[PDB]
Symmetry: D2
Subunit: 481 residues, 4 copies
């Protein structure tokens, strides 16, 4: 079976030896370096879950007949579509919705563009073939992927070609028989260099013009390709136990600058080569934004369930369940959860087959969800913070509980209404790690910016909305005077 | 009886002569008095639509075989449930979502109580039979209804029995062989005195204690019952044309104080008689809150499409649609629309049969919707006001355009980007009447307080929510 | 004595006979037409108050030495500046802060430009002289004024000269020996044609470009100037009693479209003639925006005192004063009140003399206040609406209480915790007329858009802020921790 | 000269040897432990500033005639009140407004209660004398103080005496000839065990009823009193350079649980002994909330000036200054700064003497300021987060710049519009440490909760407001339209 286990996943990262830098040093082994080993372990547990629950987490490849990841499926019926989502939710439950690049996110993108690959043939028929071959290769080899969609804009008032240093952003250096050469920088590769391969693709939102053709690239390459380096930001896993830092010590995915010094990309791994127009249409005409949104909305639901659980546990632990303002705050989170569930229900049950036979979720539902959820997420976090109150700062370590001189003092001190001190501090430390640690604050920031800047997403949502019917309804009504 | 036409509807009001008071005088005929005649004509037109499209607006009564209003249906399949909703939306589109008491709101309530009537039998088996017969009576005679759910709380820090005047709220005076006698006051009867009959029911939200048993009433009577008076608030229809006041001169429903002086109610029209515990459960255990929420969310969607339309039209007319803050304001309203359409989709397609055979909408979805939309409606209103800006105050009358001295001046002056002066003032008048007239401000207030105070609704929403799964998920996570 | 009484004020409007149109008809006499008569009587009452409280509302003219209106003063001391504001607040209290064009608002504008008129000499020295002459004329004859700053922007995605009809907005037609000819349209003359004269002036925010020179006018004319018509939007005084409509039947100021068909403006009435650059700087370099803002903040404080009053009264009548959400809403309004008073306190007591010797309020305070208050005002309105709840829709009329069949029923029905039926409906009717009548909704819209669009006002506020100090502070702090 | 230098301050802490625990172990020396050494140097530097700028930061003691700290002053004129505030702002500027328990906050409380001590005589006349004595002692020895006002609320829906464990909150155990015994816990000692003494006082907002008399204590004791332990929450200074963590590695003040095992307090250190009613009035009737509020608002202004500065630097660096949404977000911060400055101005210039002769700021201004700013602070933080966007996550370390293999790649990669890579990542790291580090989020959470829960503060503000005048105004207006039927 080509679908991989946790240890097969770790063994492939170890043998890859990608050029990865953190805290001023080259990383010898990502599987054991303190900044990465925990999140690698968490990913490994996802691959183990596929084998624990094969009937739900695997399916038969239409090309090879072997058991491959469910999250790669091309759904052709609403049942297959729901099945894909249930697999996404199983992993999302394991990571409390904290992972932005669990394999299922990229698996959806790669499938969509494999299957709906025709756009690419406008440039050359080979790029369309490459897309299909790439998806099959990814699925049949259980590749783990991230992407990078973000250029170093330096001056946002201006286009990439106008910057002081126009060569900083990733661009095409030349074309050859056997492939292409690229140089420059991409930003925010989440799980950069603890994945097998990386998709370099255009932005979801930021629409690029004719002068930016040298920057308009889509391709996928091994993380360890010669001349690629992953320069990680500072780790937010400070090496603590998962009682003390219950999230940061399990799900800290890293964000990385990606450098390309003179990187050779073989032709077979290229999808778009120096074409603003095709780039600008890639997410839309492959339907990839739809399947990517499906996964995200499903994951957001699991995550909202978790924040809700924390909120409710906090409420009970401190005995504040009877105040009106507390109940309304609880009601805010509950409404968000039901809203997201309602969009997902419509997305799946109102799905229709596209011209490639893919059962395609109703995007009117998912597009609203993905535009709304980021805007409201900071308030969900603000709610946990406000309810926890001064108790969020009363967070001694586990070690403080086991100390001979103070263990009892601390136990009695940190007592709640309905809980002993040890269980209460554990609970509050989870609320804290979710909202006020560097890991938690980053979760808020990441949800808000997940598919791009809400300011731009809002402009694009308005412009893409079918607005004529609503005018016609109002114009008829005025005519009847 | 044949389902009603518009003429039949107006004929019954005329013949009933309810005691109705407005602006300090008794009303002789509600069908011609200037405060009501326009809204009566809008109501009439809904009944006319029922006969123009019988396949969509009527169905065969399961008891008599006759065509009766679709919005009375007891849906037994998903398709019948969608069919009821489409009829509600036909009517809602004709009134741009403005009507709080189009018949379909109450028709849902009365169906739900008539079919799921067993609750009432806890006090006496006759009261459950009364609910069933009342449903059949309403459907087979195409009764138009409103209700009244709100007591005069005077001091809100206290229960009704503790007020300085304990007898002001409507309460039971005595019991008799043939019926009961009631006295006192109910508030906020929307369309009070332009309906055939009125439901007197408990609140949806506010819970009552043992000491408030004398106030715990559920019954239905004709509007013209002896001893019943409707004392109406000031009209927000100032008698202007429908170019000037395009909403207020068509859909001003009225809100009335209802007075009962020693009113006789026959036993056959009583559902709950002096029982807090039953009253507290009436909206939930009949499933009436669910079916009523179905109607409201469907109507809210039509309403939001209307607000969206107005907003977009303003944007085009003024030429502001390339500014990013304007686009984002447009986007706010669209997200609301898709949010409510998604809840409605889930409500209908995830519906299940209840013990009584009724295909019941998914209330997890409708409960969220009906709690959320009131909260967010003020913002939709605020968006129209902000976009319209100074242009909302440049609203000369139709007659100004007709005036020989100034007609041409005004036309040239009130020009827009993509519209003539006349068409532009008409559009801004619609935006104005929707948000800044007495009519429009009322629309915003009415949506906010529709099923009750959001403060109390939020508390009830929290307490009613199935919370255990979520806490268990986090506790499993903490365990390992 | 040249300061006017209420009757003198009314008799001037009657004898002036401006061309005023409302509800499809020419108005014969604004002082008795139903749409204007109440507000005219309210304005009359302000002029009467002058003479009832002369030691507070009048002062000796520096040029004639006779008693003139205090809100004309050019303050040269902090005392005289406070005195002006107390005068503003006397009138604001009589109107519950509801009037946008009480005479004091425009009186401050005309004073500031009369005194700091040197900008105008950039175009032509006579224009500076005119401004000074106009100020003295307005003060010495107690002229009541409004203004209009608003062009008919048809397509806001373009400039006035790029519109499909470029001749709709008010523009210069030609220049003659004795004056100028102007044609076109201006919007939003609040109190249009129930004042003696009108100021036609540039926007306080909207900047104009080279191509909009022909539209860049500043002048003052009598409201009855031949070729001038005031076309009023429909009145929001529907002729009710002040028990029923306590505000709309007293303070409905009107907003007029102003038409000019080949209107002649004498040169002595001109301040700016077809000059975008000078228009763009008119409010700033004259300090007019500062004195106008002083008047506005003082009036906004009065208005907030009233809203607070109404809110508290509602809370006690209904008996909800013990709910925490209710108390927090009360606290919001209180904080707004204290914020505005703080800004006024700093504005006055940190005033400094300008190069003309006018004691000039500290604009850092007033500018923040005038940017903030509009943005927060909708919420003050929302709070009254929310606390009032269902009771706001239970508004029978006075005539319902006086009807013999239903009077008693209504009285008993409408009781509150601490007030009887008649008192309760009267209070709720004031809350209603303040926030949910056409009058009330307009008040919310008027505050929000008072000095212009908050979107533009915020861009100007940011651009005009002295930002450099705060960058240097941060940059020094970073310089500490640098490596080499 | 009794005012202390930085090294006198560090020496005094080192010799006191309080019982302080963090990360599961007893701290030997708070001057050198990695969790405190940075903040201790930051406090030391405030005490050195005192001596660098004596004319502004010191004054002549009214009792001894020697030079003592200005923030202790009992102001008798508007000038002395302004001078106190300028000293507060000198220290606030060194800390970018980030320190919640710089000595000046406490010094204002202790002065207020020393001078306006009459309330305490209601229980026992010695307690009023003690408060006066305590003020002079703290001033004359330049005592650095913090306080704890928070009880372990376990079940917040119930009073302290109805808790599952009524003995957990700090309470009177017995009274003696010579003093009192207290046992139990207090919850949020900021700078616990890096000060000389701690004030144990009632809440500013939370009322206590009878039944909570055993819990209504006011006293001051040395941090090293036998039976007292400070149990610190985990450090948010993770031992990085001040280029990487520019705020967390200078101003991490620490929050401490304060434990008392049958601790002896001598009578001379007691101000309130088991009296709810007097505790409930302690902050008002001494005017201490006024002078504390003065300090906080002045500090809040310095802090807003710094957030503004960060916001504007970010906008220039990234080149986003011409977008309207960005300019409005700038304007939000400017309005807050002007609002706070206006309140402060009114507070000082409209100050009036109290019955003890202290020039007392106008509390109408300061009470609004202190209720409002906590509510608006999270928005200021969200603006920095929003504007910084993806750049906030592009934060390589200083050591990444200094690596030979990647240093130049990172410099080119992280350029801004108007700044090079190194200067840019430094700026964004300040923005990050201000809003999105453990340090940053704490700042936002501390500002919000500073003088108590806004929900309770808002109730108290409404209840305390002089409401009748506004009702009379409205009623007179209504009276005008009354029919005589």
């Amino acid at each position: 079976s080509p679908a991989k286990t946790g240890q097969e996943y770790m063994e492939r990262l170890k043998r890859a030896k990608s050029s990865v830098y953190i805290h001023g040093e080259k990383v010898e082994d990502v599987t054991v370096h303190p900044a990465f080993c925990n999140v690698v372990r968490s990913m490994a547990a996802l691959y183990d879950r596929q084998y624990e629950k094969p009937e739900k987490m695997l399916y038969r490849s239409p090309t090879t007949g072997q058991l491959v990841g469910m999250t790669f499926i091309q759904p052709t019926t609403i049942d297959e579509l729901i099945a894909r989502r249930e697999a996404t939710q199983e992993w999302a439950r394991m990571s409390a919705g904290m992972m932005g690049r669990s394999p299922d996110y990229l698996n959806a993108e790669v499938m969509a563009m494999g299957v709906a690959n025709d756009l690419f043939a406008e440039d050359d028929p080979m790029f369309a073939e490459n897309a299909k071959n790439y998806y099959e290769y990814a699925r049949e080899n259980d590749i783990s992927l991230t992407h990078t969609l973000i250029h170093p804009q330096m001056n946002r008032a201006k286009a990439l070609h106008e910057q002081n240093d126009a060569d900083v952003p990733l661009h095409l250096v030349e074309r050859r028989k056997d492939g292409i050469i690229v140089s420059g920088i991409r930003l925010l590769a989440t799980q950069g260099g603890i994945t097998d391969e990386i998709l370099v693709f255009p932005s979801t939102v930021k629409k690029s013009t004719a002068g930016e053709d040298p920057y308009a690239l889509a391709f996928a390459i091994p993380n360890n390709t010669p001349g690629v380096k992953f320069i990680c930001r500072e780790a937010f896993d400070y090496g603590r136990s998962s009682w003390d830092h219950p999230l940061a010590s399990r799900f800290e995915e890293g964000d990385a600058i990606v450098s390309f010094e003179n990187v050779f990309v073989p032709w077979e791994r290229v999808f778009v080569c120096g074409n603003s127009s095709i780039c600008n249409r890639t997410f839309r005409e492959t339907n990839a934004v739809i399947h990517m949104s499906h996964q995200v909305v499903a994951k957001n639901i699991v995550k909202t369930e978790f924040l809700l659980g924390v909120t409710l546990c906090l409420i009970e632990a401190i005995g504040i369940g009877e105040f009106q303002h507390v109940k309304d705050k609880g009601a805010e989170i509950m409404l968000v959860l039901e809203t997201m569930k309602s969009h997902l229900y419509r997305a799946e049950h109102n799905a229709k087959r596209d011209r490639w036979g893919t059962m395609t979720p109703d995007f009117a539902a998912l597009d609203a969800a993905r535009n709304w959820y980021p805007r409201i997420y900071p308030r969900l976090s603000e709610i946990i913070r406000i309810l926890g109150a001064s108790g969020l700062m009363a967070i001694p370590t586990e070690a403080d509980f086991h100390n001979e001189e103070i263990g009892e003092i601390v136990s009695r001190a940190m007592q709640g209404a309905t809980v002993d001190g040890y269980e209460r501090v554990q609970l509050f430390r989870l609320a804290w790690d979710l909202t006020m640690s560097a890991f938690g604050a980053r979760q808020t920031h990441y949800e808000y910016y997940f598919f791009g800047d809400p300011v731009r997403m809002g402009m694009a949502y308005f412009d893409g909305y079918e607005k004529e019917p609503y005018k016609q309804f109002v114009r008829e009504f005025l005519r009847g005077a």
